[PDB]
């Protein structure tokens, strides 16, 4: 496929460029540290906050349509399904609430720094902290939405066969939803010690 | 060195544009998927046509969230502004756009199924509406974060 | 750093061209899908062709949105201009352009399905028009954002 050809082309040119700079004695030109040390920390922080809710919403939306389409299909000959199985949608939607909540907390950190302190130790720490803290919450919520959704669709299909089965399968959705809390807890921990931009 | 470099407006301009672009793609997909569903089922059941357009108007709603954020962000653009104001309104653009995009896809997929099922199990309609609205808010949660960030965009900024 | 570097017009030219390019791809796809549907069904029912042609007209309008934004941007190009004007009218170009592409895909699919089905269920035609209007305004939202940005491109600018 054509996209794989692009990947190998990009890999090869990167290797050649690195080897070229190395042999000519300019290996220190490609200085990842100075890039990381000199870009504005407002980029990392705002990019983290955006992707946090953004990816969380993608997870919830993906979970809902996995569950909803099967629930509607199962309901055609068993309309009793529609009202009791709503809980599976609830477990998907709450994953978006956690994304919103973290956005509330992090937004308070976005004070504006004076120019003399822009790239100081404390401000840089907050910039990196918010970025990765946002990613873990967003990525964990994205994964969580899929797992709950796939289980929710499975529950609706099973419930239509015998009402006694739903209660037993529902247990698996609880285990799936816990991944939302753990993502939230780690997000708050790694961000909790950072200070607002001084 | 300086807080207000010449390229700072770039993030504002692309933030303003991406807010409507991604939201528009989401609403288009939501309209397309459900639209075929309506046309498919109404051939035999024309009487319930106007009951079944709900997924289309709900998809239409998402586009309006993109518009208002784009308008609210746009009024903040200026030639001289800090990187602080640049990135914070890029975050507003990304968050609403990426949220509305996801909400549009979900409304399309579940609305397609709901419209077909509703044609032969009439109790199933209320089930559809309940699920769709929980998809709609996924756009709204994007709007709220965009509003929060935008409320802060020019507060106390030195430049 | 200069407010008005020599490469500033570049983003203007890209914005000017991008406005009409993407909008034409949207209108082209909407015309193609609708055209196949019309030709496929009107063989048996030729009497209703001039009623079923509306989706082609609806897709055709989207190209006009791109044209006017492209022309309005074009007449603001100059050799010496602030970089801020370049980014703003790049954003004006993208917002209408890729909104037109999104609306084009929507009109193409529901236009085909609606025409295909309407030929054996006369009550469905009003439904097709009603859905197409929701698809149409997705382009209009892009135009409104583009014109707002464009109006802001040259006021209170120093160079």
């Amino acid at each position, epitope marked *: 496929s054509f996209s794989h050809f692009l990947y190998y082309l990009v890999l090869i040119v990167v290797i050649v460029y690195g080897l070229y700079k190395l042999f000519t004695g300019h290996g220190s030109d490609i200085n990842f540290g100075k890039f990381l040390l000199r870009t504005s920390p407002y980029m990392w922080a705002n990019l983290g906050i955006a992707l946090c809710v953004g990816l969380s919403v993608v997870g919830a939306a993906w979970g809902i349509f996995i569950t909803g389409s099967s629930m509607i299909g199962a309901g055609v000959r068993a309309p009793r399904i529609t009202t009791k199985n709503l809980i599976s949608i609830i477990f998907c939607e709450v994953v978006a609430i956690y994304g919103l909540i973290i956005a509330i907390v992090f937004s308070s950190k976005l004070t504006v720094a004076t120019a003399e302190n822009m790239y100081s130790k404390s401000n840089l720490y907050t910039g990196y902290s918010l970025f990765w803290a946002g990613i873990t919450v967003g990525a964990s919520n994205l994964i969580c939405g899929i797992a709950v959704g796939i289980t929710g669709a499975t529950a609706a299909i099973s419930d239509a066969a015998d009402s006694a089965l739903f209660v037993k399968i529902l247990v698996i959705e609880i285990f799936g939803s816990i991944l939302g809390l753990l993502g939230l807890i780690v997000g708050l921990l790694m961000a909790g010690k950072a200070s607002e931009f001084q | 060195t300086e807080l*207000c470099p010449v390229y700072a407006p770039f993030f504002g301009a692309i933030g303003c544009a991406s807010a409507i672009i991604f939201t528009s793609l989401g609403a288009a997909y939501g309209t397309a998927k459900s639209g075929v569903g309506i046309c498919a089922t109404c051939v035999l059941r024309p009487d319930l046509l106007f009951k079944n357009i709900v997924p289309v108007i709900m998809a239409g709603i998402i586009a309006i969230y993109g518009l208002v954020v784009s308008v609210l962000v746009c009024y903040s653009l200026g030639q*001289k502004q800090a990187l602080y104001t640049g990135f914070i309104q890029l975050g507003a653009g990304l968050s609403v756009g990426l949220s509305g995009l996801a909400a549009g896809f979900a409304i399309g997929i579940v609305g397609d199924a709901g419209v077909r099922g509703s044609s032969q199990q009439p109790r199933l309609f209320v089930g559809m509406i309940l699920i769709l609205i929980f998809a709609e808010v996924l756009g709204l949660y994007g709007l709220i974060v965009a509003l929060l960030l935008n409320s802060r965009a020019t507060q106390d900024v030195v430049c | 750093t200069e407010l008005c570097p020599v490469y500033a017009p570049f983003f203007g030219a890209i914005g000017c061209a991008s406005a009409i390019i993407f909008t034409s791809l949207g209108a082209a796809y909407g015309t193609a899908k609708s055209g196949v549907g019309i030709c496929a069904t009107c063989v048996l029912r030729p009497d209703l062709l001039f009623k079923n042609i509306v989706p082609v007209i609806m897709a055709g309008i989207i190209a006009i949105y791109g044209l006017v934004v492209s022309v309005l941007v074009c007449y603001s190009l100059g050799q010496k201009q602030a970089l801020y004007t370049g980014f703003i009218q790049l954003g004006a170009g993208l917002s209408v352009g890729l909104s037109g592409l999104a609306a084009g895909f929507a009109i193409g699919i529901v236009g085909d399905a609606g025409v295909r089905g309407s030929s054996q269920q006369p009550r469905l035609f009003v439904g097709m028009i009603l859905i197409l209007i929701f698809a149409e305004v997705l382009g209009l939202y892009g135009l409104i954002v583009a014109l707002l940005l464009n109006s802001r491109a040259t006021q209170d600018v120093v160079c």
Partner: nanobody
Amino acid sequence: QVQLQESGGGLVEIGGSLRLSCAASGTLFTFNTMAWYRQAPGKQREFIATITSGGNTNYADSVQGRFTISRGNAKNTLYLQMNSLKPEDTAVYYCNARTMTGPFDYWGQGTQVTV
């Protein structure tokens, strides 16, 4: 468009105290630097005082300990106060507001004071 206005000018008794007030409008950001200048007839403009957004103050030697400059509660508002005045202080006085880089450097219309 940005604009500025002085106020508080006019004639005053010898040795009297006086205050000048200034404001700037039409921009969303706080100005990095704001300052006062003066001009007597037959002379070029003379520096008087300046204050940063962080509240740091600097003065001309001639008015050291006689004049005081401060910012107001709200953004982009400025004050000058002189505890006593003498004939060599008579002039028109101007506000100035500046940006850390670029051509964005604004000046007011000015107001007169005499003994």
